[PDB]
Nucleic acid binder design. Structure first.
Ligand SMILES: [Zn+2]
Ligand SMILES: [Zn+2]
Ligand SMILES: [Zn+2]
Ligand SMILES: [Zn+2]
Lengths: 71, 74
DNA sequence: CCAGGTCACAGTGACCTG
DNA sequence: CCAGGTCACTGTGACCTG
């Protein structure tokens, strides 16, 4: 029992370099294909979790990189 | 004197006066859906998000909050 | 006018393919 | 096993209807 390094949902495998859910995986995936900068609605410290992850993409991506994800 | 109207909620161009405040089509539809039943809205931060035109799709909780704050009434 | 409907559209994530 | 694809679902907001 492994948990997403990004949001802590249950991981599905080791994706882009860390343990991660299908959600963070695909998100990260989408991200590297090109995207306008994201915007945090608050102060750049959101709580990324299983639910809240859909809300702050900016924080999600940041956390994506922080925990390691890379192509 | 006033050249334009702005959305009391998000500050984007207002389109009419909906739910009792000048509002954009976005905030109007948002509020509409929200009053149409139970809502599980969450804040990803501390319940003090900035709702503007770019951050509006981001926190539905705070958006609703301001909807009510500024006067919207069903 | 406005309220409430509608629907093309974009992000999402579970699941498939290779 | 995984990366990268797919696509059913869902929330949005621009528009329409009554
Ligand atoms: Zn995750
Ligand atoms: Zn954030
Ligand atoms: Zn608005
Ligand atoms: Zn919020």
């Amino acid at each position: 029992t492994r948990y997403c390094a990004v949001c802590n949902d249950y991981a599905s495998g080791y994706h882009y370099g860390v343990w991660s859910c299908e959600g963070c995986k695909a998100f990260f995936k989408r991200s590297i294909q090109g995207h306008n900068d994201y915007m945090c609605p608050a102060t750049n410290q959101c709580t990324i979790d299983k639910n809240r992850r859909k809300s702050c993409q900016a924080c999600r991506l940041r956390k994506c990189y922080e925990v390691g994800m890379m192509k």
